[PDB]
Design a binder for this molecule. Structure first.
Ligand SMILES: [Cl-]
Ligand SMILES: [Cl-]
Lengths: 187, 187
């Protein structure tokens, strides 16, 4: 069967970090559900792009499991993900069932909030390092994309393509990732 | 006053090529209006991301003039832009008043449809070259971003950041563009 991805979309999410992975994952033939943290209604992103989710997280979470759970960044978006008991449950289940978790920019700080993947190497946006590293529960990396087993992290809007292609490679392999990459006109 | 950008959003637009420029332009303090070609309703993009426009094009076009008119790509999106009499009028007015026009991927083929900027150097997505070059009305470039006076073009999802930063540089200068670029974590 086709792989499935859950992208959790909260108010204040970085819209580039949401749309690039959704689009690239769909190019890879992955079934992506854009799930609204707050419910079914349109979501106002950090730079005021308004995105209509495919489903509420409440509904989407009952349609698991997913091959990857994707956490976009955006400072406020990531704070909303960090405060969510529903997100906690989803991430813990994903970690338990040995499933990929991918987070970008401020997104990885939600892993800290929910105590996910301690002892991994991770990266974040430079400005999110101190939050992520509070307590020394991870080892910090400056790689544009970092992958330590099932914890896949990345740095910012400008690393979103690399982040998304790394998810494609992890799920569908290097050849599919290369095939999806070529038409994008990446440098 | 702050500069103003009109981003014309049609069904089948490439969502990455829409969101990256909207977001980057807003980071540059440019007032961006995401205007729906079809009206006020949400727009289903090429990879099924659904974006709610700020206004209909019908309404937004009466609130001109704009310092830049931005045409995203996506094969079907660009075909819709190419067929639109409203887009024709907006582009002709912009060209007449000596205003910047920026188009990416398949987007530049709408310039051909509406007879805009003939005799310029332009680039497009590699797969859109033949359509753009029908009749030899432009000179083709393989640069990731091409700018020939007031016609600014670019190639694909993977050149969207460069495209958007080039628009910022054209409107607000090199220093602002550099300032906006740094936090993005571009390579
Ligand atoms: Cl942010
Ligand atoms: Cl397309």
């Amino acid at each position: 069967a086709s792989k499935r991805a859950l992208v959790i979309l909260a108010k204040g999410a970085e819209e580039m970090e949401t749309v690039i992975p959704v689009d690239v994952l769909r190019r890879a033939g992955i079934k992506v559900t854009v799930a609204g943290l707050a419910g079914k209604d349109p979501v106002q992103c950090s730079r005021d792009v308004v995105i209509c989710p495919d489903a509420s997280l409440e509904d989407a979470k009952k349609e698991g499991p997913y091959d990857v759970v994707v956490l976009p960044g955006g400072n406020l978006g990531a704070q909303n993900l960090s405060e969510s008991a529903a997100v906690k449950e989803i991430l813990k289940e994903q970690e338990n069932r040995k499933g990929l978790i991918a987070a970008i920019c401020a997104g990885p700080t939600a892993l800290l909030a929910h105590e996910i993947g301690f002892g991994s190497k991770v990266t974040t946006h430079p400005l999110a390092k101190d939050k992520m590293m509070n307590g020394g529960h991870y080892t910090y990396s400056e790689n544009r994309v970092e992958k330590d087993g099932l914890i896949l992290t990345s740095r910012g809007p400008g690393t979103s393509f690399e982040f998304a292609l790394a998810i494609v490679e992890a799920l569908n392999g290097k050849e599919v990732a290369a095939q999806v990459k070529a038409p994008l006109v990446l440098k």
